Design a protein around this ligand. Sequence first.
Ligand code: NI
Lengths: 199, 207
Amino acid sequence: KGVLIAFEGIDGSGKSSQATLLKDWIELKRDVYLTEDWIHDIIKEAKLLTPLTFSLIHATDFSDRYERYILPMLKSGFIVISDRYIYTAYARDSVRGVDIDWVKKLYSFAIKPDITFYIRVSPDIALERIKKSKRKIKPQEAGADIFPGLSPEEGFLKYQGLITEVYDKLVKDENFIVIDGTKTPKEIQIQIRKFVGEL
Amino acid sequence: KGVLIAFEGIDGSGKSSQATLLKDWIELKRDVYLTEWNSSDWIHDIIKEAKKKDLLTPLTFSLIHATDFSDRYERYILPMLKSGFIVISDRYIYTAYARDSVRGVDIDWVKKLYSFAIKPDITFYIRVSPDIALERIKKSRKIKPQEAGADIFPGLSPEEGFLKYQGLITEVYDKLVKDENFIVIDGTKTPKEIQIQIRKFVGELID
Ligand code: NI
């Protein structure tokens, strides 16, 4: 009865918007919940911390939300949508040198999603879209902790390029439902609503 | 070369005394750094205070401590070992193994969780029954809620919780002996005799 739906994609993929668009629409049919913080003070108090410790910090926060929101609502048959799930950690942590199989074991208390949508779009195209909207490129998005002194536009191409690599390597094993993010937001959402329409 | 010596044991087992006494001896011949597992640092404190309102699950409790330990390890413990120090740990990862697993977190997952830390060259388990440790505790001092497993057994007298809670910790340590190669020291012996035995095992190694 409980169903877990996850979205993954690089920054700029529109995956958060797709996740919220799907919530609003599923709410018409049945019980759904969207994953919605001290991490603030920790990062702010650093100033370094190793990537290992960073991986633990994010896993601690993930465990908290998982056992206090995600898992209980699944037990009450909510659909739960999460627009980042453990695969985001797999990528975030392993591009910074942490043994991905170690990260997988770390997160092995979490269940596999019934569906995972990989909204796949290249970094080139993600950037030109961020630029057409005139938004500012967050340092986290540029991977500036790994590439200081690249511009923000080129960090984004490099870091999100490394992140894409990891997502592509997980596609087979993790049964990602690969979606073409070059399509428009409407075309993407309608295809997502159609896929979810099935299970 | 750097060497890592861990002390394990239940509350009231004397292990901290034994750690400190070892430190005072070894610091006469060479460089030595004593750290205590229970002395959590900045990251732990920020998380616990920030979540003071919420009830944390055991898994989360366990990650908070591993996270904080990962920082202390890369910042203090590994550099002291690389710099040639002898490192003495009064409580080490095995304490988390026991703590987190009597609260329901799967011990095999905790082992994986801490897989990043190196095994001690020597681990001393100063074995003392919970009754005997209770008796020393009385004959001195009140028992802290954490020593009594207060969260797990809020319906018990401090004394009785210490016996049930420390009993469980003892089971976990006993089941690690073989795998973790603990050197099991009979903690009913006098403190002077315990230290003499520890000093001889350490002597054998580092000489
Ligand atoms: Ni603590």
